[PDB]
Amino acid sequence: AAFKQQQTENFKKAVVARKAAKAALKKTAYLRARKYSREYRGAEKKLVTLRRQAASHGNYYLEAKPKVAVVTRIRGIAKVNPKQRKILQLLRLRQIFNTVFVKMNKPMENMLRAVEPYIAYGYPSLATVRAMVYKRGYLKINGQRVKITDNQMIKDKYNNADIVCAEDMVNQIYTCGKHFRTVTHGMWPFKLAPPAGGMRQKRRHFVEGGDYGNRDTLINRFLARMI
Amino acid sequence: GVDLTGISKKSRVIRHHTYSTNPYIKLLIKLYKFLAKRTSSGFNKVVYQRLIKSRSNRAPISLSRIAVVMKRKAVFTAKSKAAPIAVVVGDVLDDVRMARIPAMRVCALRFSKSARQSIVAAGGECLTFDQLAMIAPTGKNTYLLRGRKSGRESVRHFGASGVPGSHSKPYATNRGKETKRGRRTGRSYKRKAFRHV
Amino acid sequence: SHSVDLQWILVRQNSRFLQKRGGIRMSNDPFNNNGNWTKRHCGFLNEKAAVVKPAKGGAICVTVKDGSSNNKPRQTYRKTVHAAGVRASDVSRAVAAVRPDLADVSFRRARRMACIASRTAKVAAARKARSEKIKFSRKS
Amino acid sequence: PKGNNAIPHVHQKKHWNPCSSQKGNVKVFLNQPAQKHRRRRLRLLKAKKVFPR
Amino acid sequence: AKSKNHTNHNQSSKNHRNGIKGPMPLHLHNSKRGSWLPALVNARRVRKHNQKAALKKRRERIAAFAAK
Amino acid sequence: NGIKNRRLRLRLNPYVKRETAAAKGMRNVANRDARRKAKMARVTKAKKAATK
Amino acid sequence: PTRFKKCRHQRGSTFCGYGRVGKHRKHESGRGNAGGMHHHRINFDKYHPGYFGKLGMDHYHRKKNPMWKPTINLNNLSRLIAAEEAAKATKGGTLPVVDLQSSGYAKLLGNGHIQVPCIVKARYVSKLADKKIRKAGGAVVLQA
Amino acid sequence: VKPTVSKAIVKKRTKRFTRHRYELFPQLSSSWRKPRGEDSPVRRRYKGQKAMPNKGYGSDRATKYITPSGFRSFPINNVEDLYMLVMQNRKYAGVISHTVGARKRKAIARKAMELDVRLANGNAKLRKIA
Amino acid sequence: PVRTRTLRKRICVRFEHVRKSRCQEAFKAKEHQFQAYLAAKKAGKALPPLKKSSRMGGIVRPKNVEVLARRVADYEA
RNA sequence: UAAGCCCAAUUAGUGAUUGCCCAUUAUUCCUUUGGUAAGGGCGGAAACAAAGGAGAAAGUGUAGCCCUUCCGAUGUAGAUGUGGCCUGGAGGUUAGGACGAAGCUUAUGGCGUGAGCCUAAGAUGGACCGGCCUCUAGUGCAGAUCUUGGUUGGCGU
RNA sequence: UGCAAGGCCGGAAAGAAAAGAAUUAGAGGCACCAAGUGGGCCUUCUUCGGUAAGCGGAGCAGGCGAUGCGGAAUGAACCGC
RNA sequence: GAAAUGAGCGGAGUAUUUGAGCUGUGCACGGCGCGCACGCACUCUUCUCCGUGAUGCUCCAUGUUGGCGAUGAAAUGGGGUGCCCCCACCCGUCUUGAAACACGGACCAAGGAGUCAAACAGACGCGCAAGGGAGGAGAUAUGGUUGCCAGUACUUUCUCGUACUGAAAGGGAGAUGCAAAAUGCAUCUGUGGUGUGCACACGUCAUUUGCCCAACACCG
Numbered sequence A: 001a002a003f004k005q006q007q008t009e010n011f012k013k014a015v016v017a018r019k020a021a022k023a024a025l026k027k028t029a030y031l032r033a034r035k036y037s038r039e040y041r042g043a044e045k046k047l048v049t050l051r052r053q054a055a056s057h058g059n060y061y062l063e064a065k066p067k068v069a070v071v072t073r074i075r076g077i078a079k080v081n082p083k084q085r086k087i088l089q090l091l092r093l094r095q096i097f098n099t100v101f102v103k104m105n106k107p108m109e110n111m112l113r114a115v116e117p118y119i120a121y122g123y124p125s126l127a128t129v130r131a132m133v134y135k136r137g138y139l140k141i142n143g144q145r146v147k148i149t150d151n152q153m154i155k156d157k158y159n160n161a162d163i164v165c166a167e168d169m170v171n172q173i174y175t176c177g178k179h180f181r182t183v184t185h186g187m188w189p190f191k192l193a194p195p196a197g198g199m200r201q202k203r204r205h206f207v208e209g210g211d212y213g214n215r216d217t218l219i220n221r222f223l224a225r226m227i
Numbered sequence B: 001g002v003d004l005t006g007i008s009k010k011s012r013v014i015r016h017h018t019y020s021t022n023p024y025i026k027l028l029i030k031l032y033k034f035l036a037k038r039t040s041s042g043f044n045k046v047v048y049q050r051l052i053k054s055r056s057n058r059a060p061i062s063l064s065r066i067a068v069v070m071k072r073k074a075v076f077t078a079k080s081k082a083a084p085i086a087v088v089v090g091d092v093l094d095d096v097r098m099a100r101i102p103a104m105r106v107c108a109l110r111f112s113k114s115a116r117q118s119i120v121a122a123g124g125e126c127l128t129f130d131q132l133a134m135i136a137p138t139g140k141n142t143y144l145l146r147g148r149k150s151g152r153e154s155v156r157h158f159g160a161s162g163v164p165g166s167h168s169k170p171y172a173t174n175r176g177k178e179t180k181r182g183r184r185t186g187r188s189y190k191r192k193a194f195r196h197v
Numbered sequence C: 001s002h003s004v005d006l007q008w009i010l011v012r013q014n015s016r017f018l019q020k021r022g023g024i025r026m027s028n029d030p031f032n033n034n035g036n037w038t039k040r041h042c043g044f045l046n047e048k049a050a051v052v053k054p055a056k057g058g059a060i061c062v063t064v065k066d067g068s069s070n071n072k073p074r075q076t077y078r079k080t081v082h083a084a085g086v087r088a089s090d091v092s093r094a095v096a097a098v099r100p101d102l103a104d105v106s107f108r109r110a111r112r113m114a115c116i117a118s119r120t121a122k123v124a125a126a127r128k129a130r131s132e133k134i135k136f137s138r139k140s
Numbered sequence D: 001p002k003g004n005n006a007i008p009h010v011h012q013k014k015h016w017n018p019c020s021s022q023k024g025n026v027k028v029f030l031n032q033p034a035q036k037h038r039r040r041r042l043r044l045l046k047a048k049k050v051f052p053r
Numbered sequence E: 001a002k003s004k005n006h007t008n009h010n011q012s013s014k015n016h017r018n019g020i021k022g023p024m025p026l027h028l029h030n031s032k033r034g035s036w037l038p039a040l041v042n043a044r045r046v047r048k049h050n051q052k053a054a055l056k057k058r059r060e061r062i063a064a065f066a067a068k
Numbered sequence F: 001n002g003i004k005n006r007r008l009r010l011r012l013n014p015y016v017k018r019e020t021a022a023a024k025g026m027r028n029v030a031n032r033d034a035r036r037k038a039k040m041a042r043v044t045k046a047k048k049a050a051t052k
Numbered sequence G: 001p002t003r004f005k006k007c008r009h010q011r012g013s014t015f016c017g018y019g020r021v022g023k024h025r026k027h028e029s030g031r032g033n034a035g036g037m038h039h040h041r042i043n044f045d046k047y048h049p050g051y052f053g054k055l056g057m058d059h060y061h062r063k064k065n066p067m068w069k070p071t072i073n074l075n076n077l078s079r080l081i082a083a084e085e086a087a088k089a090t091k092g093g094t095l096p097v098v099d100l101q102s103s104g105y106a107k108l109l110g111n112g113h114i115q116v117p118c119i120v121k122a123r124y125v126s127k128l129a130d131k132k133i134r135k136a137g138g139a140v141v142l143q144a
Numbered sequence H: 001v002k003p004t005v006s007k008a009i010v011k012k013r014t015k016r017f018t019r020h021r022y023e024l025f026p027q028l029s030s031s032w033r034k035p036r037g038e039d040s041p042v043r044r045r046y047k048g049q050k051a052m053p054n055k056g057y058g059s060d061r062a063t064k065y066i067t068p069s070g071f072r073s074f075p076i077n078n079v080e081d082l083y084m085l086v087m088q089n090r091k092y093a094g095v096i097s098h099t100v101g102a103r104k105r106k107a108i109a110r111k112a113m114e115l116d117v118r119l120a121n122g123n124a125k126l127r128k129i130a
Numbered sequence I: 001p002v003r004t005r006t007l008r009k010r011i012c013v014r015f016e017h018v019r020k021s022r023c024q025e026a027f028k029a030k031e032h033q034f035q036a037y038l039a040a041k042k043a044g045k046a047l048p049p050l051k052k053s054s055r056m057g058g059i060v061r062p063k064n065v066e067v068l069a070r071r072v073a074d075y076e077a
Numbered sequence J: 001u002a003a004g005c006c007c008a009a010u011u012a013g014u015g016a017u018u019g020c021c022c023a024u025u026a027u028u029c030c031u032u033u034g035g036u037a038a039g040g041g042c043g044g045a046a047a048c049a050a051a052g053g054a055g056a057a058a059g060u061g062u063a064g065c066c067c068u069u070c071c072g073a074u075g076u077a078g079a080u081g082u083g084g085c086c087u088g089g090a091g092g093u094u095a096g097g098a099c100g101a102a103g104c105u106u107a108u109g110g111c112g113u114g115a116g117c118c119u120a121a122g123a124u125g126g127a128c129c130g131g132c133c134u135c136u137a138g139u140g141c142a143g144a145u146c147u148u149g150g151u152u153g154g155c156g157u
Numbered sequence K: 001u002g003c004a005a006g007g008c009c010g011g012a013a014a015g016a017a018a019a020g021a022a023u024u025a026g027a028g029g030c031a032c033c034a035a036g037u038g039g040g041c042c043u044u045c046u047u048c049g050g051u052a053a054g055c056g057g058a059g060c061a062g063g064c065g066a067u068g069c070g071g072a073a074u075g076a077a078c079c080g081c
Numbered sequence L: 001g002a003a004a005u006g007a008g009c010g011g012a013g014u015a016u017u018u019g020a021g022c023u024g025u026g027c028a029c030g031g032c033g034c035g036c037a038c039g040c041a042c043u044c045u046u047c048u049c050c051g052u053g054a055u056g057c058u059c060c061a062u063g064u065u066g067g068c069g070a071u072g073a074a075a076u077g078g079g080g081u082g083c084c085c086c087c088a089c090c091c092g093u094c095u096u097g098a099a100a101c102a103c104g105g106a107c108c109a110a111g112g113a114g115u116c117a118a119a120c121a122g123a124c125g126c127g128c129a130a131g132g133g134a135g136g137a138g139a140u141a142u143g144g145u146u147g148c149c150a151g152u153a154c155u156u157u158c159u160c161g162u163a164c165u166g167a168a169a170g171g172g173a174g175a176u177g178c179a180a181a182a183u184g185c186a187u188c189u190g191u192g193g194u195g196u197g198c199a200c201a202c203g204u205c206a207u208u209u210g211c212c213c214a215a216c217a218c219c220g
């Protein structure tokens, strides 16, 4: 028992160390998620002010063009041309109803124009991000697809000291930040259900009376029937 | 339902077990699979993975090759440290062409009867892998060597031998038979001894 | 010289003791507390060994192989019969002195031998009770 | 598909094995240890026959 | 009788299964054989000095070790 | 789950007990009705004063 | 062993690895090295280049016993000197005598460094083997 | 003995994988032979056809091989083979071999009550009393 | 590229059939901008300012408005 | 007074979401099987008689060393793997049989994904034979206008 | 003292800024051995011969071949998968 | 409830700090040539805290209330024969395509088709390794024995390889230093040199370097 006593005296130190690191990370996720909620509520009030200052003097407020798109794949894997098939691989949309967050810059929009009959994209809200990260957000840990259960498992994954909780990931996704790529390449591609209530027409664009293409924030009610 | 097109082509061939029927290689694979997981040393990772390998992929080393690369490391060793233990996963053969050699300490998977004699006559020592698991159990102060795979007959026959650039040897039991047409410029053409890339 | 780890490679697929019936691999070793064809439980090649056996009446025998006299086959298994109503935690310590990795299994074995000799003497108090009838040709 | 094989030259085109139509042309050494024994038995029977030369 | 002459149908799909293997870098196989020969013979004069400079530098790196 | 189970939504975001408590005095019909009584007096005041 | 054969595995597969379209048929490409310049020209040119022609003089009735001349180098002369006798060998002293024709090796060549000075008795020797054993401290003595 | 217990025996399929179209031919056994037919409806996996054995039909490994009594079966041939099943007793059951005569089954069935080892084909009348 | 590989052809032309390539022009431009910067940071301080994005949300002061309406006379052409 | 054609809705100028019906798809839950698989445990912690229980093997592959986790899974021609199955004989080991071996029979169940194995009953048989490890080959049938024997509908025509 | 070449020594190195300023279910590079196949056919689009053709011949891709399943009542190839 | 990890089960209290209001002061914003619809900085509504490692490596065992079941049945399956609703084209073969108005196909038993040898090659197993190995034949345990035993044990030139090249006559490969002699001289612990390159040795950060093994490229 001379060897077995030193092991449980070292296991005794690793229990109080994980109990300290659990409550230390509970506070700095309680504190950091309050900071972001003040930003989400306060900066939302700022644009309500500027759009009244615009409207009162007959001016217009050109809103900032959206920097983040949510992109779900709505057609299956059959009969796909090799240019369209590679872009659907480079967006990590390899199965039907897989969904990814992408940036909305000029390199990414010219990839989304080339595969529009296969995808339905649009502009997500704050609740669309946090429903996808909480309910159906998983991570690539040890090359495996493991579901987000605690913020310790997120902090063990990214090792960034800026991404320590699940509100850090919905921060970097919703407001692009310095680490949009590392958060989204951190997660597995989101695998959603088919939408309840149906799809109107898979084979035509959203303007034509169907479903593919861009929805200039209407993609939230379509994803709210899937998450 | 997943579009996994080039996903079987990313797979490689690993073979975690050995094909050998020797019951003493299986004891070293019992010992070095233990040390590979239970130690952070990259030595035991490589010594375990090279012990699995086939007898063609455990090409042997010569004793005059161990005596030259240990010399070129003992040139820039401070002489207060002794020398590494040379370890090869494979066979050490003797070299006739190198008479006198220093007192080096060699761990091999098998020695010749004459490579064993010329090591211990130089003041050296022939070790073994159970004996290397006791002195330096993680490979501290070792020098891991392989032995040469080019220069084999089979490697010299690998190729087309009649496309330009290729200097491989033809499979011919008769040496003076395949020497005429396509191998001399007077006999209608001769394959170009050099081709760019 | 010839270690137990080498002797296990030689006999694992072919032995007198293996008895691969169906696909079960149940060892016929008489120095095996478990019946399993494992390395820890085969007592004929392990350099120390200890099996617990029946004895006279209800006593519990313990056959121990210490590592000393494996060279000699008739001096290598020493047997030590305990009391008739021996406490089975003591039979576990009688083999945990030589090999502590057969401690939990030999308690269960010694407890099994006390359940059997209580039952072997229980089913003969009814079999001889059934056996009052006219029979033919007794043997002696 | 032929590949990088040696050009064979195996020299077995002259009715050498005994089939249903051919007597064959074939020489097998199954009596090698019995003629080995015979020559020694016959050298020991001869060493007696000449004795003591 | 008559059959199908020439087709290029499957070939581009066959050519991309094991990929179009891309070009190799410019430090591999950069043989100067066949290049302009007065500058090829000049560069041999220089490499036979750079080898004996490399034999002398390494020999000078050893005496700066046996004294320290 | 994680937007509907109680202890996983709180294991990930400890501030959700404040977000839900903030969104109860917003749904409250006593707070609500005297919040539109004031926002239809704070905004129209700044509307008629920015047009002068 | 017949049980180890591919026949036993594909037993039941009714084509034995030869296919439905093009069958296994007796000599579909000829018997032997047929068609070496005709329909196997790409095989015979690519893999077996210098076939098909003539080269050199005709040595009628070659005897390979008078053209016997095996070869040993200077670095492999330790193969012929006994291990008792190389250690006593020093330049300027008494050196071992190696009789090459009693060992094979009609000709001595001069590759590598000679690791022990000795007196070599050889039928033949080269420029750079004679030069290189007289400086090492031995010699070479001609024999027949 | 009473058997050791586990979850309920699922048995993905209890129907035998019989041969395709064997009922029409008295030669053809019911043992499974795989179709290599190029136009075979069983091989091409039509809708109304027989199924084919597959890795998905395999049995739950926690409950695989156990008989409906709750016992795995170990075939024995004499009395000394009861001695292996003394510790391995609530897991395995004895199956006296068919060629074991009627004289040697008495010696096996007496001791398998003494030694309390379940026989799968012996002394089921006597195990019912005690 | 031939079948499954991109082999490197070493052709030889006359000198009029080559132009010098401006392919690396935009890379030698931002390379020498990285010795323009780092020669203004370590020693001096004077830098040209970073350019703000036109994709942000500003206010629009309409200096001219029209009505896009598809008049009747747009069809008579 | 469409169950037709063109538009349009979703329970209807009521107060905002998705009328519902069907997949070898999707999500998710089980079980199997294979990974370029990824991690953990394997120095028996203490203790425990009968009249809380058993296991724990340093391991390619098993009735898988034991758990946890993740992903894939169809396929002709074809390749390969299989402590994958089967038959005759040989070397070894371990056992059966006149209280009934081989063979044959089956509303004889059992269990294996399967090839198959095993039990039981014969109101069958009447003397040989099983299991495991190796070795070996004249070693697996449904069809070749297949070979040989027999039988059968046509047909009491 | 310039030029061209191969080295040597020291320096710097947003490891590539900001301007929409990439993304990747992105391990790269070699080699051995050997099958089957080398009758194809259909389709959106481009197209040639033809009066035309369920005709003949091509281009880019996708399919059947080799593969079911859910739909178009039925249909190798259409729609969905 | 065989470790119930909870805003949920417990303890400990009367509060904790989230929003909504109403706001100060700077800045930012909106107009001009003073506004701020309360953006950034520093009274209403809400429950808030700390808790329990595995001394369990793994597996399996613990409710309640009836109905049935008293050792002659009950109960789950399995098997057998029908039936209902549903689904379902004849198998093998060539073929772009067969359910075919395309071939072969009445039933059963028993036979019935990648074998053996020779030459090379590659993969892998094994022995020895600058060496390897015979073959033929002897020899004597056996000059024995029905047999085992045509096996085993033992012993010697020939062949493959260590060196290639030339049509042939023929010739015949180390490194370094000094150095420039139509066989230069001296050393003999040694990768021919450069780029990339496991392991290991000394520092650094959350790889710098040395040696580079196997290997590749460029040369000599």
Ligand SMILES: *O[C@H]1[C@H](O)[C@@H](N)[C@@H](O[C@H]2[C@H](O[C@@H]3O[C@H](CO)[C@@H](O[C@H]4O[C@@H](CN)[C@@H](O)[C@H](O)[C@H]4N)[C@H]3O)[C@@H](O)[C@H](N)C[C@@H]2N)O[C@@H]1CO
Pocket: B008, B009, B010, B011, B012, B013, E018, E021, K030, K031
């Ligand atoms: O040696 C050459 C090699 O044979 C050749 N394949 C190629 O390598 C590619 C590489 O391709 C992979 O090489 C693997 C085997 O060589 C192969 O993987 C697959 O091979 C099959 C059987 N060999 C399957 O069994 C299995 O699907 C899988 N292992 C190829 O994927 C590519 O992955 C690299 N991207 C580029 C290499 N050039 O070239 C070698 C050069 O000689």
Ligand SMILES: NC[C@@H]1O[C@H](O[C@H]2[C@@H](O)[C@H](O[C@@H]3[C@@H](O)[C@H](N)C[C@H](N)[C@H]3O[C@H]3O[C@H](CO)[C@@H](O)[C@H](O)[C@H]3N)O[C@@H]2CO)[C@H](N)[C@@H](O)[C@@H]1O
Pocket: B148, B150, B151, L191
């Ligand atoms: N040159 C530096 C050294 O090269 C060594 O390797 C060198 C040699 O050992 C090696 O030579 C090997 C030889 O060992 C082996 N016995 C035969 C093999 N064919 C040779 O290989 C070399 O020689 C032939 C000659 O034509 C060349 O065609 C071939 O391209 C080349 N690989 O190749 C290199 C010759 O330039 C080691 N890699 C290492 O010690 C060190 O890096």
Ligand SMILES: [Mg+2]
Pocket: G054
């Ligand atoms: Mg001529």
Ligand SMILES: [Mg+2]
Pocket: none
């Ligand atoms: Mg097949």
Ligand SMILES: [Mg+2]
Pocket: J138
């Ligand atoms: Mg046969």
Ligand SMILES: [Mg+2]
Pocket: none
């Ligand atoms: Mg075909």
Ligand SMILES: [Mg+2]
Pocket: none
């Ligand atoms: Mg050679």
